[PDB]
Amino acid sequence: MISSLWIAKTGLDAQQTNMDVIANNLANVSTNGFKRQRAVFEDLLYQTIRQPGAQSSEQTTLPSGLQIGTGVRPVATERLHSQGNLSQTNNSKDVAIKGQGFFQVMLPDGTSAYTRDGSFQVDQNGQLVTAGGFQVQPAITIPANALSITIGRDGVVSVTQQGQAAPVQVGQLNLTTFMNDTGLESIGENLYIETQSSGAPNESTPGLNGAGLLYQGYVETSNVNVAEELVNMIQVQRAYEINSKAVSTTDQMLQKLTQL
Amino acid sequence: MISSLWIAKTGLDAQQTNMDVIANNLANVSTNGFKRQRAVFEDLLYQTIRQPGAQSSEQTTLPSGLQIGTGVRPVATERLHSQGNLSQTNNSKDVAIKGQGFFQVMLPDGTSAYTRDGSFQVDQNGQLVTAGGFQVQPAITIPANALSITIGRDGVVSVTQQGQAAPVQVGQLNLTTFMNDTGLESIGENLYIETQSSGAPNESTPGLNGAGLLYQGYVETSNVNVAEELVNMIQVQRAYEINSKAVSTTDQMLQKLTQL
Amino acid sequence: MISSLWIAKTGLDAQQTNMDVIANNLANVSTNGFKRQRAVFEDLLYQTIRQPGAQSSEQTTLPSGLQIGTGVRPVATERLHSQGNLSQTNNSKDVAIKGQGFFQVMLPDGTSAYTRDGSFQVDQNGQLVTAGGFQVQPAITIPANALSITIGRDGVVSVTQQGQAAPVQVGQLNLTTFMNDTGLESIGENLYIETQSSGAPNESTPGLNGAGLLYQGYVETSNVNVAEELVNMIQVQRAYEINSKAVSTTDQMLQKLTQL
């Protein structure tokens, strides 16, 4: 209708998207291994009426031409892959990560996923799963008669059989490092998958190739700064205020145009 | 949005970091060998509106030009290395340092760390470690036939055997001094590794070379005096409240500007 | 549009700048050496209609003619250069100043900066810097075997060498005073640079030529009176409410002028 109303409508969309991101970040506190999301905006087309160059006379040049511009297209959303605060959970099946790296997982479809959540489990077969039956990889089988499981900072997992006075080594839990942590696609279930923005996964032992270490009895908390989220909430609410006010102003302009 | 909103957001971040380090410091009260960590801040941009010079006439000078300023960027959370108190544990294997000095430790990964905590122990192979396999330099092996172990205030550790009534020295436990005691970076367990900001660690025997003294049967408590850090908490809490008040004031600001 | 709306616009802008200053002061509590800021306002033009003199008859004079006037232009923001509270940081590497004076610093561009911050640090080459490798003036190098670094109230820095029982004089730490402390142009980083309104810098040893003393082991706190900032913030919230009411009244006047 008016060139102003479309611009204000894009502004409403941008503030709504940013509030969506804030709400998702806010709600996923107390979700282990969650990475705060941050939306990055970017303006669309500038429809030019007079080119910024475009010499008018033989001496004049017309500095700073007239172009109007529209829109606030949300160009991306990054994800902050910083180390989350560890907390002492005192459970032997909670393993957290100190440094870059992801646990690998086999999805039921056969393709591989990745996750930074160590709140593991043992299923009715004794294998190592994660809250959804997702077999960690490479498969780790805990013998039935084990009384404890110890997962060292080197990822070398061993169990203590009854009777035998030895922690028989039951496997090695290795991490995976990507070149672009932010580029991983999130599929829910606190699981990521491979995509060409991430790059080829580099599987490695914890400690080497820049991978992290493993802390048994710790859980990695979501790095959601409540203070920043709340100030963002205030600002987004006020920006939505202002943009709806712009829509209202253009609407009144149009209605007085119509009345004539 | 509004300039004051951005500036107060930076302030809220800064005071949240203050209270975070204060809470971490309370988390380590009565834990021997802990140092009161402190945060050092830094102001960001100053938006110049009128230059403080800006000759406004042939002769007029306009002193104290107008400029606004933003933000409270925290440069660092530095590590205060000050002398703390000593408590009586009455253990010969627990040593406390009085004055300047750091305990040399050969890290299990093969590097060098230092700690102001001397609750050493003896392992199965005789190496002098302290709650985590922290071996000192030079390597000292306690004889297996030892009866009593005594560590002198000068850094000499010795053992006594059956029959012979002579306290033959078995090892030298010398201190390590830093030009900069603060720049050290922790690697956990109160171990701090040599850093480019700490200065060259000079290996010097206790008593001589301007080092401190060794107290046997004593342990160095954390320098976290409850009274001082409670005073800090009260002040920082006031700062946090007033900054949040500025944020809400800018909110009410904008709300009345929009109810316009 | 309407003269009322322009005058009120300037009023809103002035109150906004005042709130910006208050918010910057409020955020910068607990920032070492920070100086409070105060905004000085200044009304704009007075558009005369009947001249205040302007003899009407051959004997009468028309006292107090009619002139309308506009605007509240904020003319300046002075920086209160009063001494802050010293607090016992107990660090051998933090030195505050008692009285007038700034630590000169050589920027990477080479131009002379000045800081009232005593959180000095040492780089990998051993010298004295300030939290970012800003090489203090005059050139000072702490020897590698130095143990304790004392900064005398006279301003001489000396180090405790390896073995030798002498605190060898290793450098001089001398301040700079200006005729116009308020005129220094802040550039962030807790740094002030000379401007043509500050006056030429005068270099002298601490304690002399009017400069202040050096207090080793202390840090100077920002001289921000929190309650004063609170009262200022309440006042500016009221003023902004009032000016928004003025804008609303002018707008309603216009609206039923057009509805006419």
Number of other CB atoms surrounding residue A207 within 10 Å: 17
The subunits that touch chain C, with at least 3 C-beta pairs less than 8 Å apart, are B
How many angstroms separate the CA atoms of B108 and A250, rounded? 70
HEC sequence for chain A: CCHHHHHHHHHHHHHHHHHHHHHHHHHCCCCCCCCCEEEEECCCCCCECCCCCCCCCCCCCCCCCCECCCCCCEEEEEECCCCCCEEECCCCCEEEEECCCEEEEECCCCCEEEECCCECEECCCCEEECCCCCCEECCCECCCCEEEEEECCCCEEEEEECCCCCEEEEEECCEEECCCCCCCEECCCCCEECCCCCCCCEEECCCCCCCCEEEECEEECCCCCHHHHHHHHHHHHHHHHHHHHHHHHHHHHHHHHHHC
Separation of alpha carbons A236 and A14, rounded Å: 10
Could B5 and A235 be called an inter-chain contact, meaning their C-beta atoms sit closer than 8 Å?
A: yes
Tokens of B198: 């700490």
Mutate to test the interface with A, among B7, B236, B247 (most CBs of A within 10 A): B247
Q: Which amino acid is at A49?
A: I
Report the DSSP beta bridge partners of residue A122.
A128
Q: Scanning the structure block, which residue is given the tokens 């509590």?
A: C29
Q: Which residue of B has its CA nearest to A237?
A: B251
Please tell me which of the candidates C24, C90, C251 has its beta carbon nearest to residue B7. Answer: C24
CB contact under 8 A, B9 and A242: no
CB distance C31 to B254 below 8 Å: no
Q: How many helices (H) and strands (E) does chain C have?
A: 2, 17
Shortest distance, CA C60 to any CA of chain B (angstroms): 38
Residue spans of alpha helices (H) in B27-168:
none
Q: Which residue has the tokens 């660092």?
A: B76
Give the SS3 label for residue C245. Answer: helix
Single-letter amino acid code for the residue at A112: S
C176 membership: H or E segment, kind and range: strand C175-177
Quick one: which of A117, A91, A134 has its CA closest to A30? A117
- Which residue from A241, A193, A236 is spatially nearest to A41, judged by alpha carbons? A236
What value does the CA radius of gyration of chain C take, rounded to a whole number of Å? 27
Q: Return the partners of chain A (3 or more C-beta pairs < 8 Å).
A: B
Residue C242: what are its φ and ψ, rounded to 5°?
-65, -45
Q: Which of A231, A239, A241 sits opposite B247 (nearest CB)?
A: A231
Using alpha carbons, select from B175, B77, B181 the residue that is nearest to residue C92.
Answer: B181
Per the listing, tokens 């506009």 go with C70
Cis amide linkage into residue B138, ω under 30° from 0: yes
Residues in A closer than 8 angstroms to B12, CB to CB, are 227, 231
Which of chain B's residues have a Cβ under 8 Å away from the Cβ of C180?
63-64
**Cβ-proximal residues to C183 (8 Å cutoff; 6+ apart), any chain:** B52, B63, B64, B65, C195, C197, C198, C199
Nearest to B1 by CA among A238, C15, A44: A238
Helix (H) or strand (E) segment spanning residue C233: helix C226-259
Chains near B (3 or more Cβ pairs under 8 Å): A, C
Resolution reading in Å:
3.2
What are the distances in angstroms from CA B247 to CA A41, A122, B4, B254? 24, 48, 8, 11
Is residue A75 a contact partner of residue A43, using CB atoms and an 8 Å limit? Answer: no
Question: Pairing state of beta strands C156-160 and B94-98?
Answer: unpaired
Contacts of B247 in chain A (CB under 8 A): 231, 234
Interface contact flag, B12 A225, Cβ < 8 Å: no
Nearest one of A85, A113, A82, A96 to A181, comparing CA atoms: A82
- Whole-number Å distance between alpha carbons of A71 and C15: 30
Residue among C99, C125, C126 at smallest CA distance from C205: C99
Q: Residue A239's closest chain B neighbor by CA?
A: B1
